[PDB]
Design a protein around this ligand. Structure first.
Ligand SMILES: [K+]
Ligand SMILES: [K+]
Ligand SMILES: [K+]
Ligand SMILES: [K+]
Ligand SMILES: [K+]
Lengths: 95, 95, 95, 95
């Protein structure tokens, strides 16, 4: 399960790296803003402080969302049940 | 399952075509902006860069959301488990 | 199941009526804008075109979200599997 | 199950307290605005009326989202099935 977590962890990093590079390059975001914009889109928070201004960006976002949401939510799920939950349980009993 | 994927794939295309046409016509969006606005609504990202200004648009969006979220999420789900996951598994072993 | 659908359908109407009345009264929205703002919040689209400006509104929204998301998503779910899906299946075969 | 509800209830309070304190301090929000901004992010509504302006804030939000969504959604789930649902059922029959 650490190896189930690790495949979804890596893939998520590679996916945010993807949006980071595209949005930095094409839409002109500082690298730090691209990553934050990539994370705010794929988790569907969607603040709207950054948003794609070019047609090339609007199209990329359509696909990135569909391809990206499934992964991201899956990592989060793996993260919560397989890492957060056990550590919570372990805190309720002392060693 | 390719045929389960294909029914949710088609239906999703027909649903985004619906919002594209309505928002282009009534709310005056360029076709490309309507589709992007339709995709950003039904996945609940909700940037807010485009938003309906007319009462006819505000009402349409209420129903489109309820009718549309169930489908869109279902396609994404089908897409992730039945297409993304296997291709991931196949990459871990060489032919 | 029509009666499972009908309890979640009613409850959802009562919940949107709640936000409609509160946001119209306290935050000064036209009734039509309140309902649309209520629907855009509880499905977590969150355009941000309308947003609560008063402290009384910011607090109400905190609770309305927590109390409201569970219902709304549940109706949508019931709506998709128990109404949309069968009608889709029925279209694939002619009477 | 009251004790399953109570662990997710507490943890959620502690998590919103976290964002409240960080966003008040670093991003300069009034305490009431931080909490509302924290609740609007972790449920992925994302109005965008408040949004982090500093790099320290953009980074914190990236992690807070990933760590926070799993909990918050889990509480909401527990809240809906284990508290809202029974009270609904109890209203359909008189004592
Ligand atoms: K949003
Ligand atoms: K927004
Ligand atoms: K879900
Ligand atoms: K959103
Ligand atoms: K959302």
């Amino acid at each position: 399960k650490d190896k189930e977590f690790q495949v979804l962890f890596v893939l998520t990093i590679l996916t945010l790296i993807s949006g980071t590079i595209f949005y930095s390059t094409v839409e002109g975001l500082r690298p730090i803003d691209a990553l934050y914009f990539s994370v705010v889109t794929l988790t569907t928070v969607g603040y709207g402080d950054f948003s794609p201004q070019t047609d090339f960006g609007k199209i990329f976002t359509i696909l990135y969302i569909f391809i990206g949401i499934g992964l991201v939510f899956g990592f989060i799920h793996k993260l919560a049940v397989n890492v957060q939950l056990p550590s919570i349980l372990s805190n309720l009993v002392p060693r």
